[model samples]
Target: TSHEAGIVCRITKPALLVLNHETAKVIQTAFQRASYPDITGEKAMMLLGQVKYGLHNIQISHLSIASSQVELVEAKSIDVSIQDVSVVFKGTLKYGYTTAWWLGIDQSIDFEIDSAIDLQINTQLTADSGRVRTDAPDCYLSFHKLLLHLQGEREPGWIKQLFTNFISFTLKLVLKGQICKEINVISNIMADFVQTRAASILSDGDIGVDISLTGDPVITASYLESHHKGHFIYKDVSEDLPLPTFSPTLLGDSRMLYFWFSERVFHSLAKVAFQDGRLMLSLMGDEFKAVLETWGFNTNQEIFQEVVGGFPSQAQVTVHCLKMPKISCQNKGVVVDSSVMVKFLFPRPDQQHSVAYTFEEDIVTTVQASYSKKKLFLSLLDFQITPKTVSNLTESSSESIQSFLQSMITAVGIPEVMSRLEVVFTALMNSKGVSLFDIINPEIITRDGFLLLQMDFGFPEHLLVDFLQSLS
Candidate 1:
């Protein structure tokens, strides 16, 4: 398509495929972890109500896949399709028992379910529509395929058997009809949530991206197609340009294009006339030191600045993708064949021009203290970018940045099992008399704020053992 030239980006399998497989696995985990409501006699009916509510509000583990296929359809539009995907959902239901309600027997049915669903998404987009749509009809399936296989149970006697069997049948009906419907609604919401959030993340001043799906599932029996669409608008006359035409084949390979284009965009931005006092390089000694630390170098300030000073207006970037975690794949109940990584060089402003700056090396690893809060959190170790002391950036900088960024993604990409390890470790610390200070030791603190924390003794071994066990 002939449109404004835009950048393309992508993330691929192992991550996406594994995520797809974990969807059902997560649901199964939630059930095992859930504390079923306890109700006596007729009041037990309340359990049903609880079940519904619990299923609704439950947060399965955080589901994520590795990469997304993106196309800068001409420059004015974007089409993103998530390939292999995985997700965890916690669902809840709340209802009152008729008998308990009438007699005031303090009875209710409350059900809580922790479920994960692995997903395979095939999304398509067109610049004209700016809507993203999925192929599975964006469908989701439970990994606990055989619901009847409940282990560690003895065969019930006649009366117990009859009641249990009846209950089982009723539960199946609810899952297939009510629960399934609710899941679809929630899935749509989630898809929208992700798309909107992604779009917002890409937004910039005078430039905004609109994201949407191709449509609901359209079926041809043998094959299905789903897609997502995004529109990028530039309000600033300086940045805005004429729209371009569409090309299906080219759009499919959009990620490839963006990888190169974003680097260009960054350099272009660096060259623009600054409204601020002077066009100065933001690169700091501490920042350069941090980047070197990640690369395992000791203090060498003069050498670092010499290297940083030579960054050109443009540098090449490369990407390398790897496999997703097994749990993610198991959740999807499918196998992932491959992975992808996208890496590129981001130029530092010319030192002679005095116009480049680098933030804290580990800033990329920062997280929220609480999932619900707006606080920043950092891990022990992080990645940094530094100039090669003797080698000018023209030849060495691009390759160096590409390698560092690629390694950073792998080093910090925490799988579900590892994520659990972090949670358990935090809990154990809280259980004991340990404070945040104890977990983050004063002795290990990096003085210049450049040392990346790779590992800490404060993280207990049991948590690591459990995480490994889950992987096995």
Candidate 2:
């Protein structure tokens, strides 16, 4: 069902910057993990009666990173620049003369390198897989200074010149290749981690909400927008329905974040609860008498007394929908139109004389939702119940019985059902600590065809700290 439903969430540029800042430390870890292996090279020259020289066992140490910067490129990708990465290389050098055997020499040396590098990563957001994919095809490395110091003995001036002309240049290329590859790997790991954590937040026990992407994410000058399939999953069963199309005009840019949902999403939830048999209510004799008394009816009246002779032990009331409830969004609230069958059973010791009643009714109600004290509240605005038919009763008493039942249904039955629904929904949302997200000033607005939830959130510092610590 999520494959067909559409939900939209828009995040502004400011939020993206926050995420970048939070993850900047991870980039430093990537740089430290990119290892530089030993490098060896040989060269020949026509100097000092034909000489051959070799640089071997080159390794880097004392790596210190000065600064790292991130910049957002409009409608493109992100640019990352690291400045003045200082490192030291230790190695051995040997030179031999082909014509003069006495002129051969060996020396140890240390080289210090100060480097600056830039990485340009192109990134795309895909909905089908709900992940961010990136490529760093354009990477550049530059060396500001490479100085060589010979150990134990002073080296020939030409030896220093040789490294500047050849060894240093080749080393720059090797560093760029390794560092860029490690950066890409770390970036993908971070993306996948976020997607998995988000999915976990939306799931609880046998019920879960599917938030898969419906299409590629959109990036604009001011914000990023992603579309999702907002389908309900209950008891491992999911409904299949096409997603409703959404327009950018449906939301405004004032809020920090916005989430939009279609009416069909609510309808599907109701269907699932119905199929699970949660719509049935059982009442003991005393409880039924109390309800009747609240409606200005005397349970011991002549009419009731003659019918039952005495209060029964139990009463069972079951409600089943004849058709799916029709849901609508309005400025005032959400309205539901439902047609249902209500059955009443009064069991007796003498089963042959047991009384049963069945009837059909059309119910209409308007409901408003709010959140306070970390609990979701659904309040009934107004309701109307119209009885259509009554079965298994004499024609003369049917009309009177129908009128009495209709009065009780509107006054007590509907409100009690609404109360139970509110409790169930609130418990469901709180099951997974959804209320602990620190959402601030959340507003739920009902429009002509959909609903919008806009809110700002306080960063959950403890949760983030635990997550980052676990990555180690």
Candidate 3:
């Protein structure tokens, strides 16, 4: 199962190291949300009388996190270290001390607690039922200072003694409990957010890729890798086939992001696109005549005058796939088999439609694909068209007309189909929000039975903020 994955995503260690700069923001939020419960207790001492005291309504008012860093522990977990989390907790302080024996006045004063904490965490990234789940059971915090400030009270040297005596211990325990809990909770929430976000990125209406994790994420000292099903599902149906074996050496860590896909994934995408009725192209009126005229053939051709026996300006041309196209990956090239049907129609003088010429052809093509500047480019390298049947020809000029049709279809038909294919590819990505990120220096490499895409991204600051801030 580990070796067979339809798609794989690798986020290198360099990328994670860069991510720490923003991870501190999420840490600060966790600290801000920590619940600091009120402390209520009494302490009796020799010099001071019996006092009933505790802090009321402890809540974090200000929080700041200095730095956050993460490291990979091979075969174990990812360790995160957070430093200098300075937090201020504000609340009401109430206390009463007995005077000399057992009598005294109760005093109520406001107070603030300033604390500097260093936190450490060990998080395990595990796969749960095809989803990424974060397990952060071990989180530690060490406090440097727990100084108390009494408002409107003089030096109150005696009150200071009481806060230090019992308050520190209880406050430390409360802070640790809530802060660690909140951080772990937010940790898993972030995992879910990213997984869901990625799934939606490649989704369109009834067509979507099942990007669920196929196995536990593989961790190394230099990168984190995740395997995905990468199966395209339409109407809750997917092709159940054994996945191809993936090789880690096919990928490298220099780029911040990497995606490896089996050529079958492309076939699955084509399947959905075919079912969605997106495999058809139509040309009408002037467009049809222009395409024909481009090949030095016009409606004035003897063949056109005999066939259809109709009009040219009112002509219509349609080229569509009768079934899903087969896509295969080869070294530096992709081979496609299209069972295509082309039709030529024109209007008769009686305002009726008549078929001029119609034929089904097998369009076998080899193309080179590349990605740059946030666009998809497929340039046709070579192709062959085998006409299945030719119609609307009178026996007198059938041979010559057929020869003419073959030449025009080669010159005019192939380029038109290829050009429209490029347009269709570019438009799908644009309309699907591919332009939202910076795809820096992407290399789309096709090998025997596989395809690979590697690139560095600007990591759209807005997308990060939106996902993180949404949780905050």
Error of 2 at 373 (Å): 3.2
User: In order, how many clashes per candidate?
Assistant: 115, 2, 1
Worst 10 residues of 3 by lDDT: 392-401
Query: Candidate 3 overall Cα lDDT vs. reference?
Result: 0.79
In terms of TM-score, which candidate is strongest? 3
TM-scores for every predicted model = 0.30, 0.68, 0.87
Alpha-carbon local distance difference test for all models: 0.32, 0.66, 0.79
RMSD of each: 20.3, 6.8, 3.6
The stretch of ten residues in a row with the least summed lDDT in candidate 2 is 112-121
lDDT of 3 by residue, 44-142 (tens): 755775677768988778888888889988777889999898888888888777544454567788888999999999988899988998888888989
- Tens-place lDDT per residue, model 2, 100-124, is 5676554445444444444444454
- Name the better of 1 and 3 by lDDT: 3
Model 1 weakest lDDT span, ten residues long: 325-334
